[PDB]
Each structure stands twice: as C-alpha cells, then as structure tokens.
C-alpha cells in the first residue's frame, strides 16, 4: 500500500506509531492544518525475538523532523505502555507541553527524572477543557486499573474525535467513581465522527466482574489464615491495594509494603489521596518480623515471577528481611501476562515445596481485568453512536473482534477502519477513510546508545545461544563445551588447510572448523575468523 498524499486542508489525519497490531508502545498522532497532537507515548517490553534489548519504542522517525509542529502530548493514564517512552520524545524536544491528570503527571515526573528531564506540565481533570493551538480537548473520567485515567475528546474543524484510553465499565468500583458513560453519551448526541476504542478484551463475551468482587474474597482468605498472609499485586492498582488494606485492618492485622516499586507508588498514592490508610496500620518492612505472624499482611510486587522481584527472592530463601514458612498463605492478586508462564509457575512451585498455601485467580476471585469485555463495549457503542470507528490497543484478533462489535450495533462496515501502525486515516468533510501507509519499525533501546542495534545484531544474539568457536593458531570458545581437550582435534585440521598457497583466509578456516564441528559434535555454534 502506497504512502498517503497531502492531507486536504481542513481535514484531519490519524496515524499510530505503535499499539495497533500489538499490546504495547501506544502512540497516536493527529495531524490538522500542519500541526500535530500526540495522544500517549508508551514502551513495549521485549520478547524472545529481541534478546539483550531493554525497551522498544514507537517509531519516532515520523515526528523527528517536524518536532516544531507538535502542539502537545496528551496522556490518558500512567501505565508504562502509555508513558514509558516520553523521556525519549522529550529528549528530541524538551519543552513539548505534557497534558494529563495529577496522578499521571506524577508518574512521568518520576520517570523523566531518571533521564534528567523536567517536563512542561499542564495538569487536567475530568470535565475540563483545554486548547492546544488548532486542537481543543475535553476530558472524561475513566475507571480502569489505575487511578485518574481520562478519556479524551479532540475537537478540530474536521469534526469530533473520542479516544477512550484503556476503558472499563465497572459500575461499583471501590473508589465510587465509575466511568462517565453519561458524559460520553451526551457527547455522542453532539455527533462524534471518529471513535478510537480499546480492543484488549473485545473477544471476551459478556460483562466483566467488578473490582469490588475482590475485597470479599481477600477478606475471606485473610480471616481463614492461621499465620501470615502475603498478597502480590501490581503497585499501580491502588484500588486493589486499598481493598487488601481494608480487609486486613478489619481483621486486626497491620500491613507492610515490600519492594521499591510498591513502596514508591503507595507513597505517591497516599500523598495524592488515592490510598487512605492510618500510619498506625502500617509497619516498616524491617520491623514486621517482630510480631506474631497472624498479625501481619505483607503487600509485595512480583506477580510476573521476575527473578529480582521481592516474591521471587522470598521463594528462593534469599530475601533480606523476610523468610517464608509452610504456615504462610500467598495470594497472587493478579493475572499471568502471556510469555511469563514458566516464570510464574516456578515461583508457585518453589512456594509449594516450602509448604505454603498459594491461591491464584484460577482458584478464587482474587483478580479482575482492567479492560472492558465485549458486552461493556456495546454500552459504549450504543452510548456514543460514532459515525466511524477505529479499533486501537490490540493485536489483530482483538482488533477484528472489536470491529464486529461495532458492526453489530449498526456502524456501517465502510465506517469501521482497521489501521495498523503506520496506516493513516483521513477524516474529510465528515467522511473517514484509510488514506495510505508508511513503514514503522521497532526502535530499540539498549543502554546509552540506540539505533546501532537492529535485525542483524539480534540475529547474531539468537545464533550465539549455541556459543561460538573462534579461530584467529589459537582455538577458543565460550558457549560451547567444558572439555578443554575438545579444541585439539581441530588444531591439526586447521594447519592442514593452512598449507594452501596460491580475506580468502576468512572463508578458508571458518569453513574448515565449521565442517569439523558439524561432523564431530553436530552442534552449530557461530564460527568467527
Ligand atoms: Zn492501562
Ligand atoms: Zn494499556
């Protein structure tokens, strides 16, 4: 598919630089009358195809040469796949206004300090409007698995856009602030031309359970526990922490946070008023072991089995302050992100060896998702009634599911646009269509440089998982064998090819050891001259 032409004056162009064919690094660029508005700037964490890499960024080459045009960066909420790449954007232009709610802006402040950046903040709350050049924005309360999420209406001259952010429709969130479906319904009456809609759970039928179903289950588990209780969850889910604390306090226990991410984030949550707990209900971690075990609940990180997490360390008998016993109850108040199963089940099995009881979502209602199920999205589609629909935040199977949901409410199929990263969507005179594609790749972060690591380097790293045998005589290897005498049978055969007189040395003994190995050992390490 070809690149798009110029954008008809007065129209609007929408393009994702990440987040559409995958879960992660969401970044969406809106173009209008030469100016730019960006909604979200997240990272993607690397998989097996990307060894040695730290982060994956949205493809910023597409704004690198027009950074002067960006009017603002607007942020739905504070999860890493929406804010993680902000330091790299601000390194390109440090004074881009950054718009968001108080809790969101607190997280990017802390993230941007790691890179020695001080953002220009414009702080925003639901119900408020702000102007950013040719763009105007209005913010709608969203309930999600993290406080202070916001959905965003963008008004230009081309019409009205609505971006949901990560959206869910819990009608009884513990914090009593459900998503503002009324307000978005009234905006639908106004006429919304384009709806950008979270697809994460679009293939799950029905309506998802309330986050408030978790509290009673945790209360039941703590009441029945004879010893200490340990609850692992995500530090960003303040309403989950609040329910753990409320259950523990209601049963005469005190609470302790374990792990830097948990300690830092609950500090922010307490300061901004999202977490309400009395100082006498908290114990410092280095003083929790002084009390009776049945008097403490520990709240930790490490739901994903990351080896340096607090719960991993505890499961191996290598936590400084805490030692686990068969009398402990461990609750994984979370779900298993795909690609982490081997690691999570390893921690569970180390805990089972010790004799501790482990409770996961598979056995009890200890976790709910933060994204709307298909039946909740239907409420959104009937409430907003968008003239056109673009699914975002999802892989193809999710984007397609969301497409059908919108179709089944009456959105014409020609008005349901599926635009992968790099595919533009033009909204012109009220009609919306796909207009062309540019290529987008994965920008890698590996330490202090970036951009010198690419397909060939990852290929070499993948090959090197069988070690390497290097010739340039002295034979050496590293990921190959523990037998020192294993190099010798190749030394004789190397000189033999060296009695040959007539870079061709490279392809000469590199081909000579390669035959010796794929014959003696039937291994295939990398051979380097
Ligand atoms: Zn999120
Ligand atoms: Zn997300």
From Swiss-Prot:
Gene3D superfamilies: 3.10.20.580, Metallo-hydrolase/oxidoreductase (3.40.50.10710), Ribonuclease Z/Hydroxyacylglutathione hydrolase-like (3.60.15.10). Residues 1-265 are annotated as: Not absolutely required for RNase activity. Keywords: Cytoplasm, Endonuclease, Exonuclease, Hydrolase, Isopeptide bond, Metal-binding, Nuclease, RNA-binding, rRNA processing, Ubl conjugation, Zinc. Its EC number is 3.1.-.-, 3.5.2.6. Zn(2+) 2 binds at residues 81-82, 166, 393. There is a cross-link at residue 485 (Isoglutamyl lysine isopeptide (Lys-Gln) (interchain with Q-Cter in protein Pup)). It comes from the Bacteria. Zn(2+) 1 binds at residues 77, 79, 144, 166. It is found in: Cytoplasm. GO terms for molecular function: 5'-3' RNA exonuclease activity; beta-lactamase activity; RNA binding; RNA endonuclease activity; zinc ion binding. An RNase that has 5'-3' exonuclease and possible endonuclease activity. Involved in maturation of rRNA and in some organisms also mRNA maturation and/or decay. Has both beta-lactamase and RNase activity, but the physiological relevance of the beta-lactamase activity, i.e. whether it confers antibiotic resistance, has not been shown. Homodimer, may be a subunit of the RNA degradosome. Interacts with chaperone DnaJ2. This is Ribonuclease J. It comes from Mycobacterium tuberculosis (strain ATCC 25618 / H37Rv).
């Amino acid at each position: 598919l070809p690149p798009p032409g110029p954008l008809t004056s007065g129209g609007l162009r929408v393009t994702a630089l990440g987040g559409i064919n995958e879960i992660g690094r969401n970044m969406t660029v809106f173009e209008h009358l030469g100016r730019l508005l960006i909604i979200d700037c997240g990272v993607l964490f690397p998989g097996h195809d990307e060894p040695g890499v730290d982060l994956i960024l949205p493809d910023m080459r597409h704004v690198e040469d027009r950074l002067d045009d960006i009017e603002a960066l607007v942020l739905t909420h504070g999860h890493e796949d929406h804010i993680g790449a902000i330091p790299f954007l601000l390194k390109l232009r440090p004074d881009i206004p950054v718009v968001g709610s108080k809790f969101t802006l607190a997280l990017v402040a802390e993230k941007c300090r790691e890179y020695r950046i001080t953002p220009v903040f414009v702080e925003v709350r639901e119900g408020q409007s702000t102007r950013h050049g040719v763009f105007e924005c209005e913010y709608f309360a969203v309930n999600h698995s993290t406080p202070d999420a916001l959905a965003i209406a963008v008004y230009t001259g081309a019409g009205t856009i609505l971006h949901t952010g990560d959206i869910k429709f819990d009608q009884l969130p513990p914090d009593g602030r459900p998503t503002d479906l009324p307000g978005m319904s009234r905006l639908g009456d106004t006429g919304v031309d384009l709806l950008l809609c979270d697809s994460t759970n679009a293939e799950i039928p029905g309506v998802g359970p309330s986050e408030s179903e978790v509290g009673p289950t945790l209360h039941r588990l703590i009441r029945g526990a004879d010893g200490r209780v340990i609850v692992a969850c995500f530090a960003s889910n303040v309403d989950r922490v609040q329910q753990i604390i409320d259950a523990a306090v209601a049963l005469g226990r005190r609470v302790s946070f374990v792990g830097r991410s948990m300690v830092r984030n609950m500090r922010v949550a307490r300061q901004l008023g999202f977490l309400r707990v009395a100082d006498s209900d908290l114990i410092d971690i280095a003083a929790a072991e002084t009390m009776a075990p049945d008097q403490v609940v520990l709240i930790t990180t490490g739901t994903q089995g990351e080896p340096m997490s607090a719960l991993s360390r505890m499961s191996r008998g290598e936590h400084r302050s805490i030692t686990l016993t068969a009398g402990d109850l461990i609750v994984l108040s979370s779900s298993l992100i795909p690609g982490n199963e081997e690691a999570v089940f390893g921690v569970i099995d180390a805990l089972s060896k010790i004799g501790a009881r482990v409770v996961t979502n598979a056995q009890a209602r200890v976790h709910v998702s933060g994204h709307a199920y298909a039946g909740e999205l239907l409420f959104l589609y009937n409430g907003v009634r968008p003239r056109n629909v673009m699914p975002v935040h999802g892989t193809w199977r999710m984007l397609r599911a969301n497409a059908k949901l919108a179709a089944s409410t009456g959105v014409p199929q020609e008005s349901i646009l599926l635009a992968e990263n790099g595919v533009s969507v033009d909204l012109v005179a009220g009609k919306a269509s796909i207009s062309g594609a540019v290529p987008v790749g994965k920008m890698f972060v590996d330490g202090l440089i970036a951009g010198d690591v690419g397909d060939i380097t990852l290929g070499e790293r993948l090959i090197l998982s069988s070690g390497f045998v290097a010739v340039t005589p002295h034979l050496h290897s590293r990921g190959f064998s523990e037998d020192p005498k294993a190099l010798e049978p190749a030394v004789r055969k190397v000189e033999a090819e060296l009695e040959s007189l007539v870079i061709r040395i490279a392809q000469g003994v590199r081909r000579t050891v390669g035959k010796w190995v794929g014959e003696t050992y039937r291994r295939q390490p990398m051979i380097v001259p």
